Amino acid sequence: MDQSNRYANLNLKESELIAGGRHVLCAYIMKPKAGFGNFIQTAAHFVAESSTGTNVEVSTTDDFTRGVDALVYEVDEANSLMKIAYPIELFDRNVIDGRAMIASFLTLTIGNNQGMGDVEYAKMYDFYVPPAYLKLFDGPSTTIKDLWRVLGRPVINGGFIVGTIIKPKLGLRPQPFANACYDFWLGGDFIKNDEPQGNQVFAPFKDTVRAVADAMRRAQDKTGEAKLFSFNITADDHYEMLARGEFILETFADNADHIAFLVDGYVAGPAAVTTARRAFPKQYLHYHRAGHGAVTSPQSKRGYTAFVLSKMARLQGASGIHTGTMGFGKAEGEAADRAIAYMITEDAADGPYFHQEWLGMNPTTPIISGGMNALRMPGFFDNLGHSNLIMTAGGGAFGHVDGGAAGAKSLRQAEQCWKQGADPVEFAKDHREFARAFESFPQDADKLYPNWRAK
Amino acid sequence: MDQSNRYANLNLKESELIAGGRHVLCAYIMKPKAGFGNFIQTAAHFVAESSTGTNVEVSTTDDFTRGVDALVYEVDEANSLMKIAYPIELFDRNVIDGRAMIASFLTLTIGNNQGMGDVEYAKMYDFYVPPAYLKLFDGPSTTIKDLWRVLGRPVINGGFIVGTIIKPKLGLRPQPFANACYDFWLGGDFIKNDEPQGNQVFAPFKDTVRAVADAMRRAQDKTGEAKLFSFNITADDHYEMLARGEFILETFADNADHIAFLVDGYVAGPAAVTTARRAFPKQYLHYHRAGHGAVTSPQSKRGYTAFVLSKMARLQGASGIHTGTMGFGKAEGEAADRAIAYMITEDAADGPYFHQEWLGMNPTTPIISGGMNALRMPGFFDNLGHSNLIMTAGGGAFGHVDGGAAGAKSLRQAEQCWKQGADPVEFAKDHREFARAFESFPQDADKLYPNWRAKLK
Amino acid sequence: TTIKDLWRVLGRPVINGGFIVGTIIKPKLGLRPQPFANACYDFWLGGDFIKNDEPQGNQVFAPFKDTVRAVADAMRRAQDKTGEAKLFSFNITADDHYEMLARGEFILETFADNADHIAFLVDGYVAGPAAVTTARRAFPKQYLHYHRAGHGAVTSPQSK
Ligand SMILES: O=C(O)[C@@](O)(COP(=O)(O)O)[C@H](O)[C@H](O)COP(=O)(O)O
Ligand SMILES: O=C(O)[C@@](O)(COP(=O)(O)O)[C@H](O)[C@H](O)COP(=O)(O)O
Ligand SMILES: [Mg+2]
Ligand SMILES: [Mg+2]
Ligand SMILES: [Mg+2]
């Protein structure tokens, strides 16, 4: 049944909808399935299933309901483009504090409409949130500044935070785990649990946290420098997350503010992210996005993009989120992904379709990870334009021929090489650890630098 | 770099892995991306990124780590098949009660491996959980039995629960909302919040809960029959969910056991499902899967299938989950989806690759929804084989020409027609509400029944 | 929770899983933490199930947490020795609702991966239904073991 006359108003202007500040805008790449309605008809049903309607008319509908209908206000069949305007009154609010929830946003904009039989596929590429709705989100409470302050760095442009992931992903018992932490910290700043590390039977949570706490104290006493750790506290059970978080902070004691909390936000869900954000607002919230690739991949024409996921995470209150290597690492990513970083860091930025004013909402740090090492870093920073971020290199550090500590220093020197604007191969002649990264990863060295070995 | 020698052991036999009861098995349909390694090489890296390794060798690796490596134990490149065995020691456990978490299962089996550059796509179609890992999951604490008991039905095979969704999806104010609830309950049993309904500014949560609570009392007093309602309590904030849930139960008072709690488990995540499951174990947990289509659709070759999503939901403790209309409704689905229903309801069932014993773990109700009406119901039931379930028809009920109450009765009579094995058109001549469903949805009636008008009016 | 859940842990059929061999640690009171745990290990070499005698808890000569830790170790040792699963029923009876939570919560964390091997015993007749309900609602996933000490005062045929 055709509901275009109700759910479609292409005479509406995007500029006025933004100026109004009473609508969330979303931009989709949608394709109707063969044997049903044309583009606007299918788009109309899409809007219905995403706001106020269903697949048939019902007597219970009144004029007030019609007033809050979402509306397709712009379409371009030749590019499969479909823009929809959602009145902000549609989105659910907390009874307890009147604040917004991303779960309601997801349910309407990217929920049931992903299972429509008359649609072949549809994927959100961008969305706009007006001021009245934006200010109702938590936003980040801790930022990279709080990490800079702990490291004794300038709170403004404090610079690059050298990081790694403890590898193997799983298998290290408590003390072997802590030993690797100590080694890396002799040359680096930051360490995160690999995403699945927690309370495995061969590496009990409390024993590992205790061993790492010891390793931090030993490393700090040895180097005279502050060291950071990001603990995975992900769990199905809200109270398990609290239990883990509380034990960590008590255990680390005077080093409690050296701690970040990692949450697998995509698989555990927004509910888990909000648990950490609200229970531990004074601890850096580290959003790990494992599993996101199922929808965000360009290979997928469903769900939403990495850009959308990142923008949402900032609203949820992620202190930092993985944004990818932007084509310079091992995972799917493009140089154009730099736009994602700007969107989560700046107070004003452009998306693929919408300009977003953030109204002083705190930034989310772009966390760079995925097959990175000292050799690949200069190219990466060139594409982004800055190094005010956290970069973790698991294999890149612990895969160094001279050990984790040397690996750490190679990452440090790689960024110093870019900041000096020096040539990597020439730079290497005065920095062994960086030069030794060439021998550690000769295939990367051969591709990135053609004749590094002779020179 | 090639890691086949470490992460691949094709000499392992599946029967031994199952008999051992120390491995979670997963079956994927994977395709390597062009310009990298062959199938087994790509499969090896996939396993590494899904268990103990990364894209390069590291000095920190010891033999104990190698002892817990996941392993590719079966492949079929001509069919793009890849089976992986995960040692159960890899999966995270709660510090507080030593129980399992689905979040850890997802992180390893379907996490980082979905973003691999050397893989074009990979999708989980089935998984096996041994007893030692299975018993560590919550499982459902409430089942349809408890809804049957309230309705005064037999607790075993209590039969069909006539349901609907309040439509419009959003827009009804508290009392107009409650009025629609009263109308439907005159002929039906069950009503659920549409998935986004909650605390909208035009329909305050507490005002609506109070209005619906009043409507239930009026409808039950009117019909002398018990009536059920499923409230959406989804929220980012764990404490918001508790606040909503606690207010509902107190408000309904002596009808508190008539209440189910709906959670948008896919978009809100397992954390939200577990909050409801553990805070309110005595209330029927209604898992709404909105958004699942992004990965479960056959159009997608990433993530996991609807079968996997449903199987996980049983472990998480869903009292019921939407399983789709199996090709008979408005959403993407196939007739073969009946197998999903069997997997979540039976104590033993076969998946696309693995046989699963549930060891007495409680069943999860298949909740049928999505463009269903009285006309489409007989066909759906024929494919499934039973009607011991909940079916909700929003448009099918409130889209009835004679109103929501008539709509309810049409759904009731439609199911009565299938169990009696009667001819729908002939059945209609003695059942008005069912007959009026033809005139309500003539397009469906014309295709499903060719000359109903001649046989009726 | 039912016997089905105990059968599942023991690796028995969940339907008609059969006889669960059990005992009570004797002396009723007097055993210090390690001698207590030693008796647990001994019995578990041939049996499945062990319950605290009804008054055993936090006596000054057998601190609760010290004993819980010792039994947990004994369970691991017994299970490693026999390759068989072992069950224990801890008395968590108390006047104070929050004491019951404290005992139960400490036990489950301590036993960790063996947490589902634990049953909770409550002296339901003398402590009352309130204590039974505390355990039932706080720990629905743990086998609730109702001990009826004192019941004889009214239930005895001698009493009318
Ligand atoms: O498990 C891993 O692979 C990593 O620890 C990187 O390890 P390596 O440094 O050894 O590659 C990260 O979790 C991924 O980068 C996540 O991907 P993303 O940031 O794109 O979400
Ligand atoms: O919002 C809706 O469209 C529904 O209320 C159906 O309404 P109608 O009865 O009016 O069609 C259900 O939430 C969908 O069935 C969900 O799909 P699924 O069950 O496949 O997850
Ligand atoms: Mg990782
Ligand atoms: Mg719905
Ligand atoms: Mg006794």
H or E element that contains A115: none
Most distant CA atoms of chain A, gap in Å? 81
Token couple for C127 = 């402590």
Cβ neighbours around A254 below 10 Å, total: 7
Please name the amino acid found at residue A143.
T
CA atoms within 13 A on the CB side of B364: 32
Q: Give dist(CA B74, CA A25) in Å, integer.
A: 47
Q: Which of B123, B286, B288, B311 is catalytic?
A: B288
A57 Cβ below 6 A of ligand 2: no
Cβ distance of A441 and B53 shorter than 8 Å: no
**β B390-392/C22-24 pair status:** unpaired
Q: Are A117 and B330 in contact (CB under 8 A)?
A: yes
Q: How open is the CA angle B28-B34-B38, to the nearest 5 degrees? A: 60
Please name the amino acid found at residue A263.
V
Q: Are B98 and B136 in contact (CB under 8 A)?
A: yes
Token couple for B418 = 């299938």
Is residue C81 annotated as part of the catalytic site, yes or no?
A: no
CA B156 to chain CA centroid, Å, is 21
Token couple for A277 = 């954000």
DSSP code at position A72: E
Token couple for A252 = 């680390």
Token couple for C91 = 């008395």
Cβ distance of C8 and B131 shorter than 8 Å: yes
Q: Give dist(CA B330, CA B336) in Å, integer.
A: 16
Residue A260's beta-bridge partner residues? A230, A284
Q: How open is the CA angle A424-A426-A431, to the nearest 5 degrees? A: 80
| C36, burial (CB in 10 Å: exposed 0-12, middle 13-18, buried 19+) | buried
Which residue among C8, C15, C111 places its CB closest to the CB of B98?
Answer: C111
Give the gap in angstroms from C-alpha B378 to the nearest C-alpha of chain A. 20
Cβ neighbours around A260 below 10 Å, total: 23
Name every residue whose Cβ is closer than 8 Å to that of residue A139 and which is 6 or more positions away in sequence: A314, A315, A317, A361, A362
Pick the CATH number of B138-440 from 3.40.605.10, 3.20.20.110, 3.90.740.10, 1.10.357.10: 3.20.20.110
Query: B6-30 in b/e burial notation, b at 16+ Cβ within 10 A?
Result: bbbeeebebeebbeeeebbbbbbeb
CA atoms within 13 A on the CB side of A96: 15
CA B418 to chain CA centroid, Å, is 24
**β A23-32/A119-128 pair status:** antiparallel
Give the closest residue (by CA) to ligand 1 atom 6.
Answer: A370
DSSP code per residue over A131-142: HHHHTTS---SS
Q: Are C107 and C118 in contact (CB under 8 A)?
A: yes
Q: Give dist(CA A399, CA A404) in Å, integer.
A: 7
Q: Give dist(CA C57, CA C60) in Å, integer.
A: 9
User: Under DSSP, is residue A97 helix (H, G, I), strand (E, B) or coil?
Assistant: coil
Q: Are B158 and B144 in contact (CB under 8 A)?
A: yes
Ligand 1 pocket, CB under 6 A: A 165, 167, 194-195, 289, 322, 324, 330-331, 369-372, 393-396; B 49, 54-55, 112, 115
Q: Give dist(CA B243, CA A157) in Å, integer.
A: 42
**β B303-304/B119-128 pair status:** parallel
Q: Are A374 and A363 in contact (CB under 8 A)?
A: no
Query: C50-87 in b/e burial notation, b at 16+ Cβ within 10 A?
Result: bbbbbebbeeeebebeebbbbbbebbbbbeeeeeebbb
Which chain A residues are within 8 Å of B54, Cβ to Cβ?
167, 169, 371, 394-395
Distance B231 CA to ligand 4 centre (A): 12
Name every residue whose Cβ is closer than 8 Å to that of residue B27 and which is 6 or more positions away in sequence: B81, B82, B83, B124, B125, B126, B127, B352, B353, B354
Pick the closest to residue A252 from A226, A274, A289, A273 (CA basis): A226
Q: Give dist(CA B104, CA A196) in Å, integer.
A: 6
Residue B285's beta-bridge partner residues? B261
Q: Per-domain residue ranges for chain A? A: 5-137, 138-440
Ligand 1, pocket-test mutation among A191, A369, A376, A380, most atoms within 8 A of CB: A369
Q: How open is the CA angle B380-B381-B382, to the nearest 5 degrees? A: 90
DSSP code per residue over B306-326: HHHHHHHHHHHT-SEEE---T
Name every residue whose Cβ is closer than 8 Å to that of residue B320 and which is 6 or more positions away in sequence: B144, B284, B285, B286, B287, B364, B365, B366, B367, B390
Is B5-137 in CATH node 3.40.190.10? Answer: no
Which chain A residues are within 8 Å of B393, Cβ to Cβ?
none
Q: Which of C26, C65, C97, C160 is catalytic?
A: C26
Query: What distances in angstroms separate CA B420 from CA A29, A250, A344, B437, one per listed residue?
Result: 47, 66, 61, 19
Q: How open is the CA angle A324-A327-A329, to the nearest 5 degrees? A: 70
Distance B303 CA to ligand 2 centre (A): 22
| A279, burial (CB in 10 Å: exposed 0-12, middle 13-18, buried 19+) | middle
DSSP code per residue over A354-372: -EEE-TTPPP-EEEEESS-
Please name the amino acid found at residue C2.
T
The method of structure determination was X-ray
CA atoms within 13 A on the CB side of B201: 10
A5-137 and A138-440 in the same fold = no
Q: Are A305 and A274 in contact (CB under 8 A)?
A: no
Percent helix, strand and coil across chain A, each to the nearest 5: 45, 20, 40
CA B50 to chain CA centroid, Å, is 26
Name every residue whose Cβ is closer than 8 Å to that of residue A104 and which is 6 or more positions away in sequence: A91, A92, B196, B198, B234
Percent helix, strand and coil across chain B, each to the nearest 5: 45, 20, 40
Pick the closest to residue A269 from A315, A205, A313, A314 (CA basis): A313
H or E element that contains A289: none
Q: Are A262 and A192 in contact (CB under 8 A)?
A: yes
Which residue among C8, C112, C140 places its CB closest to the CB of B98?
Answer: C112
Looking up tokens 């590019």 gives: A79
Taking the CA of B396 as reference, the closest ligand is 2
Identify the contact set of chain B against chain C, taking CB-CB distances under 8 A: 93, 95-99, 131, 135-136, 138, 141, 281, 359-360
CA-based radius of gyration for chain C: 16
Q: Give dist(CA B30, CA B42) in Å, integer.
A: 9
Q: Are B163 and B390 in contact (CB under 8 A)?
A: yes
What is the three-state SS of A428-446? Answer: HCCCHHHHHHHHHCHHHHH
Q: What is the resolution of this structure in A?
A: 2.2
| A237, burial (CB in 10 Å: exposed 0-12, middle 13-18, buried 19+) | buried
Name every residue whose Cβ is closer than 8 Å to that of residue A165 and which is 6 or more positions away in sequence: A191, A192, A193, A194, A369, A392, A393, A394
Ramachandran angles phi, psi of B437, nearest 5° = -70, -25
CA atoms within 13 A on the CB side of B381: 23
Residues flanking ion ligand 3, Cβ below 5 Å: A 194-195
What angle in degrees, to the nearest 10, is found between the helix axes of B377-384 and B404-419? 40
A301 annotated ligand binder: no
Cβ neighbours around A224 below 10 Å, total: 6
Q: Give dist(CA A8, CA A45) in Å, integer.
A: 10
Q: Are B245 and B205 in contact (CB under 8 A)?
A: no
Please name the amino acid found at residue C126.
V
Strand order in the sheet with A81-87: A71-76, A81-87, A23-32, A119-128, A303-304
Cβ distance of B299 and A91 shorter than 8 Å: no
Q: Give dist(CA A70, CA B237) in Å, integer.
A: 26
A169 annotated ligand binder: yes
Is residue C145 annotated as part of the catalytic site, yes or no?
A: no
Looking up tokens 């612990």 gives: A398
Give the closest residue (by CA) to ligand 2 atom 14.
Answer: B370
Which atom of ligand 1 has the smallest separation from the CA of A325? 20
DSSP code at position A301: -
User: Under DSSP, is residue A398 helix (H, G, I), strand (E, B) or coil?
Assistant: helix
Q: Which long-range contacts (CB under 8 A, 24 or more apart) does B427-432 make?
A: B428/B452, B428/B455, B428/B456, B429/B455, B429/B456
Q: How open is the CA angle A17-A23-A24, to the nearest 5 degrees? A: 115
Most distant CA atoms of chain C, gap in Å? 52
Query: What distances in angstroms separate CA B300 from CA A298, A303, B121, B147, B292, one per listed residue?
Result: 12, 10, 9, 36, 11
E runs forming strands in A58-146: 71-76, 81-87, 119-128
Cβ distance of A236 and B271 shorter than 8 Å: yes
Ramachandran angles phi, psi of C106, nearest 5° = -70, -40
- Phi/psi-derived region of residue A156, left when phi > 0, alpha when psi is between -120 and 50, beta in every other case: beta
Sign of CA dihedral B266, B269, B275, B277: positive
E runs forming strands in A212-332: 228-232, 259-264, 284-288, 303-304, 320-322
Q: ω before C157 within 30° of 0 (cis)? A: no
Q: Are A270 and A102 in contact (CB under 8 A)?
A: yes
Q: Give dist(CA C116, CA C4) in Å, integer.
A: 12
User: Under DSSP, is residue A222 helix (H, G, I), strand (E, B) or coil?
Assistant: helix
Which residue among C4, C113, C140 places its CB closest to the CB of B98?
Answer: C113
DSSP code at position B237: S
Q: Give dist(CA C156, CA B247) in Å, integer.
A: 45
- Phi/psi-derived region of residue A423, left when phi > 0, alpha when psi is between -120 and 50, beta in every other case: beta
User: Under DSSP, is residue A220 helix (H, G, I), strand (E, B) or coil?
Assistant: helix
Which atom of ligand 2 has the smallest separation from the CA of B370? 15
Q: ω before A168 within 30° of 0 (cis)? A: yes
Please name the amino acid found at residue A104.
S
Q: Are A434 and A410 in contact (CB under 8 A)?
A: yes
Name every residue whose Cβ is closer than 8 Å to that of residue B407 and which is 6 or more positions away in sequence: B164, B184, B187, B393, B396, B397, B398, B399, B400, B433, B437, B440
H or E element that contains B405: helix B404-419
Q: Give dist(CA B427, CA B448) in Å, integer.
A: 15
Please name the amino acid found at residue A52.
T
Q: Give dist(CA A398, CA A407) in Å, integer.
A: 6
Q: Are B376 and B434 in contact (CB under 8 A)?
A: no
What is the three-state SS of chain C? Answer: CCHHHHHHHHCCCCCCCCCCCEEECCCCCCCCHHHHHHHHHHHHCCCCEEECCCCCCCCCCCCHHHHHHHHHHHHHHHHHHHCCCCEEEEECCCCCHHHHHHHHHHHHHHHHHHHHHEEEEEEHHHHCHHHHHHHHHHCCCCEEEEECCCCHHHHCCCCC
Ramachandran angles phi, psi of B185, nearest 5° = -65, -15
Which residue among A96, A107, A240 places its CB closest to the CB of B96?
Answer: A240
Q: Provide the Cα torsion C33, C34, C35, C39; round to 10°.
A: 100
Token couple for A440 = 């550690």
Cβ neighbours around A285 below 10 Å, total: 28
Please name the amino acid found at residue A287.
Y
B393 Cβ below 6 A of ligand 2: yes
Q: Give dist(CA A445, CA B13) in Å, integer.
A: 41
Pick the closest to residue A104 from B235, B155, B35, C22 (CA basis): B235
Q: Give dist(CA B399, CA B444) in Å, integer.
A: 13
Q: Give dist(CA B275, CA B273) in Å, integer.
A: 5
Give the gap in angstroms from C-alpha A48 to the nearest C-alpha of chain B. 9
Looking up tokens 């089905």 gives: C4
Most distant CA atoms of chain B, gap in Å? 81
Cβ neighbours around A446 below 10 Å, total: 13
Ramachandran angles phi, psi of A143, nearest 5° = -130, 180
Residue B230's beta-bridge partner residues? B192, B260
DSSP code per residue over B33-98: PTTS--HHHHHHHHHHTTTT--SS--TT--HHHHHT--EEEEEEGGGTEEEEEEEGGGS-B-TTT-
Ramachandran angles phi, psi of C8, nearest 5° = -60, -40
Q: Give dist(CA A304, CA A298) in Å, integer.
A: 10
H or E element that contains B106: helix B102-109
Please name the amino acid found at residue A435.
A
- Phi/psi-derived region of residue A198, left when phi > 0, alpha when psi is between -120 and 50, beta in every other case: alpha
Sign of CA dihedral A427, A432, A438, A441: negative
Sign of CA dihedral B120, B123, B129, B133: positive
